Amino acid sequence: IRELKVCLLGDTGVGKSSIVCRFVQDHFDHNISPTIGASFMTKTVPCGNELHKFLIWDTAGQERFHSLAPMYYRGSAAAVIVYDITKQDSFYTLKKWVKELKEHGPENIVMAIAGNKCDLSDIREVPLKDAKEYAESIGAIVVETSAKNAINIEELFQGISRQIP
Numbered sequence: 001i002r003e004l005k006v007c008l009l010g011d012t013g014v015g016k017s018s019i020v021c022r023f024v025q026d027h028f029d030h031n032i033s034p035t036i037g038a039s040f041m042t043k044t045v046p047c048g049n050e051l052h053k054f055l056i057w058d059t060a061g062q063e064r065f066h067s068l069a070p071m072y073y074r075g076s077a078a079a080v081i082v083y084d085i086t087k088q089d090s091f092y093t094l095k096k097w098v099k100e101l102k103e104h105g106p107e108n109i110v111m112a113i114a115g116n117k118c119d120l121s122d123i124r125e126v127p128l129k130d131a132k133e134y135a136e137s138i139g140a141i142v143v144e145t146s147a148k149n150a151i152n153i154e155e156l157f158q159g160i161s162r163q164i165p
């Protein structure tokens with residue numbers, strides 16, 4: 001068993017809790033309420049010839065909670081930074097989280113970007129190519145996901161697993 005601390009960063013409403021909830025519980029609630037404080041969940045996944053037990057810290061995205069964020073991301077093997085493909089604002093917040101992360105988190109932290117709500121493509125505001133370049137220009141992976149339709153949730157975490165010895 002290889003314990004991996006992962007933290008979720010992103011603006012409110014982007015789907016951080018929905019992603020974890022899909023990953024861990026294989027469940028989606030359209031009426032999932034916001035997170036107050038933080039939420040911890042865990043899932044063990046076989047990767048190569050070793051087990052990866054993800055210790056997932058799903059942080060509350062709301063403004064009043066930013067002041068509590070360094071507590072969860074410090075000591076993290078990886079950080080999942082989530083935007084909402086349907087709101088471009090959520091994509092600039094992603095950049096502000098990346099910055100804080102390169103300044104206050106582990107020197108060697110795995111960066112993964114999730115372009116959540118990809119099922120709402122008919123209202124897309126963030127092209128995949130723009131997110132792919134940004135990810136490449138920061139040594140991060142990018143996957144467009146949908147917690148709703150279970151698209152690339154498992155793959156998002158296979159992305160983290162792949163970038164570790």
Ligand SMILES: Nc1nc2c(ncn2[C@@H]2O[C@H](COP(=O)(O)OP(=O)(O)NP(=O)(O)O)[C@@H](O)[C@H]2O)c(=O)[nH]1
Binds near residue numbers: 013030062120145146
């Ligand atoms: N269509 C669609 N809706 C989604 C998807 N993921 C999340 N949502 C919806 O988006 C809303 C916010 O989801 P949530 O997971 O709470 O986001 P959050 O970033 O965790 N919220 P908070 O930051 O306040 O804790 C909810 O209504 C949720 O059902 C998705 O892939 N597709």
Ligand SMILES: [Mg+2]
Binds near residue numbers: 060
């Ligand atoms: Mg939440």
